[model samples]
Target: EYVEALYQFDPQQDGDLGLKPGDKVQLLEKLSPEWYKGSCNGRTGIFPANYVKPAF
Candidate 1:
């Protein structure tokens, strides 16, 4: 099994996606064990995790 770093929703930035540093968001729907993907808040973007962050 592999562990991925998690980030939080940034509330300081206006119009931000609520991604803040140190925010713990466990990836629910990742692309795969090799790539990190997300579909949270009805928006799909690259995961904040570095070890398993998305590559697209």
Candidate 2:
């Protein structure tokens, strides 16, 4: 499965992916359970899994 960002996410720390609303990201990996790894804007990092949805 895949997902897209729903809102702009500004990472609170380093190594977090920054996203803008409507940005499409490839679901890379799942970590811990609720967190995920993704790639957007040529940058890859972690973010909340709920922050995105399955792209249309």
Candidate 3:
């Protein structure tokens, strides 16, 4: 599964993924209602769930 970024996110910690609008992230795990783990731009990390939407 995948998600498409809706806004840019600058990671504040080591395990966070940096995002940009339109970036496609491969969904790995949903940590909670507000966060998810995924792979993008050759990196795997967590990001805000609200910043992305299901890609398909």
Candidate 4:
């Protein structure tokens, strides 16, 4: 599944994906209620789930 980023997320950690508004992210796993593992910009990493919405 994929999601569209709602806001920019500059990764602060090595495993965090850097996101830009409107970026499409391919979901890999749901790590928690707030975090998700996904791939974006050719990189795989974790990001805030709330920062994106399901791509429909």
* lDDT for position 33 in model 1: 49
Off by over 4 Å in 4: none
Which ten residues in a row are the worst by lDDT in model 3?
A: 47-56
Quality of model 1 by C-alpha lDDT = 0.42
Best by lDDT: 3
Encode model 1's per-residue lDDT on 5-47: one tens digit a residue.
3455443433323444433334555565454544444644554
Task: Give the alpha carbon lDDT tens digit for every residue of 1-56 in model 4.
Answer: 99999999999989999899999999999999999999987999999899999995
lDDT of each: 0.42, 0.85, 0.95, 0.94
Stretch of 10 with least lDDT, candidate 1: 9-18
Q: TM-score rank, highest first?
A: 3, 4, 2, 1
Please list the residue runs of candidate 2 whose C-alpha ends up more than 4 Å from where it truly belongs after superposition: none
List the candidates' TM-scores in order: 0.29, 0.84, 0.95, 0.94
Worst 10 residues of 4 by lDDT: 47-56
RMSD of every prediction: 7.6, 1.5, 0.6, 0.8
Model 3 stretches astray by more than 4 angstroms: none
Q: Write the per-residue lDDT of candidate 3 for residues 19-38, one digit (tens) a residue.
A: 99999999999999999999
Model 3 TM-score relative to the real fold: 0.95
